[PDB]
Amino acid sequence: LGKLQDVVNQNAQALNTLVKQLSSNFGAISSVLNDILSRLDPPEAEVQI
Amino acid sequence: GYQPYRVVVLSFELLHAPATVCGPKKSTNLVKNKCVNFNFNGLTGTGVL
C-alpha cells in the first residue's frame, strides 16, 4: 500500500514544515510576537513585525 | 567636547531562567481552569492554566 501511504506523508510533512516556519526570525529580533510587543513600543515594533 | 562626560551602560541579560531583579509591580492571586490573561516574569499570554 505504498501509493496511498505516500500521499499521507506528502501532506503531513508539508503541514509540519509550515508549523516550524513560526520559529524563524526572518530578520526580526525574535520569532515570538508577544516578546516583541512587550519589549518595544509600537513605533519601533512596527518595523520588526 | 574636551570636558569629560560620565557614562553608565546597563546591560540586562534576559536569560530564560529565574529572574533575580524585577520591577515594583505587585503580583496577584493565581487562578486556574479558566481562560485568563497571565503574566510570568514578563512572559505575557492568554490561556488556561
GROMACS .gro file of N, CA, C and O in nm, chain B residues 31-46:
model
   64
   80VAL      N    1  -0.515   3.188   3.948
   80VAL     CA    2  -0.641   3.126   3.907
   80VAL      C    3  -0.610   3.018   3.804
   80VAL      O    4  -0.510   3.024   3.733
   81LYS      N    5  -0.698   2.918   3.798
   81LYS     CA    6  -0.674   2.801   3.714
   81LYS      C    7  -0.805   2.755   3.651
   81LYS      O    8  -0.914   2.787   3.698
   82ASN      N    9  -0.791   2.679   3.542
   82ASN     CA   10  -0.900   2.612   3.473
   82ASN      C   11  -0.996   2.707   3.403
   82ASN      O   12  -1.101   2.664   3.354
   83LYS      N   13  -0.963   2.836   3.396
   83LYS     CA   14  -1.048   2.935   3.331
   83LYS      C   15  -0.962   3.022   3.240
   83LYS      O   16  -0.852   3.063   3.277
   84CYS      N   17  -1.014   3.049   3.120
   84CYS     CA   18  -0.942   3.131   3.023
   84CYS      C   19  -0.910   3.267   3.082
   84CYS      O   20  -1.001   3.348   3.104
   85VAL      N   21  -0.782   3.294   3.108
   85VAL     CA   22  -0.740   3.417   3.174
   85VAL      C   23  -0.615   3.470   3.105
   85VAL      O   24  -0.542   3.398   3.038
   86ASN      N   25  -0.591   3.600   3.124
   86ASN     CA   26  -0.469   3.665   3.076
   86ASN      C   27  -0.364   3.658   3.186
   86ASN      O   28  -0.391   3.695   3.301
   87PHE      N   29  -0.244   3.612   3.151
   87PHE     CA   30  -0.142   3.582   3.250
   87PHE      C   31  -0.011   3.653   3.216
   87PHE      O   32   0.020   3.678   3.099
   88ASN      N   33   0.065   3.683   3.321
   88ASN     CA   34   0.200   3.737   3.312
   88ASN      C   35   0.288   3.658   3.408
   88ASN      O   36   0.247   3.632   3.522
   89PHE      N   37   0.407   3.620   3.362
   89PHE     CA   38   0.502   3.547   3.446
   89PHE      C   39   0.642   3.602   3.417
   89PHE      O   40   0.701   3.570   3.313
   90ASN      N   41   0.694   3.683   3.508
   90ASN     CA   42   0.829   3.738   3.497
   90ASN      C   43   0.849   3.817   3.369
   90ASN      O   44   0.963   3.837   3.326
   91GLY      N   45   0.741   3.862   3.306
   91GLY     CA   46   0.747   3.934   3.180
   91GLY      C   47   0.691   3.859   3.062
   91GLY      O   48   0.661   3.922   2.960
   92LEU      N   49   0.677   3.727   3.071
   92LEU     CA   50   0.614   3.649   2.965
   92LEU      C   51   0.463   3.668   2.975
   92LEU      O   52   0.401   3.624   3.072
   93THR      N   53   0.405   3.734   2.876
   93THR     CA   54   0.263   3.768   2.876
   93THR      C   55   0.189   3.683   2.774
   93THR      O   56   0.236   3.665   2.661
   94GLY      N   57   0.074   3.631   2.814
   94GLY     CA   58  -0.005   3.549   2.724
   94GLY      C   59  -0.149   3.541   2.769
   94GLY      O   60  -0.189   3.603   2.868
   95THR      N   61  -0.227   3.464   2.695
   95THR     CA   62  -0.367   3.439   2.727
   95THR      C   63  -0.395   3.290   2.712
   95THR      O   64  -0.359   3.231   2.610
   0.00000   0.00000   0.00000
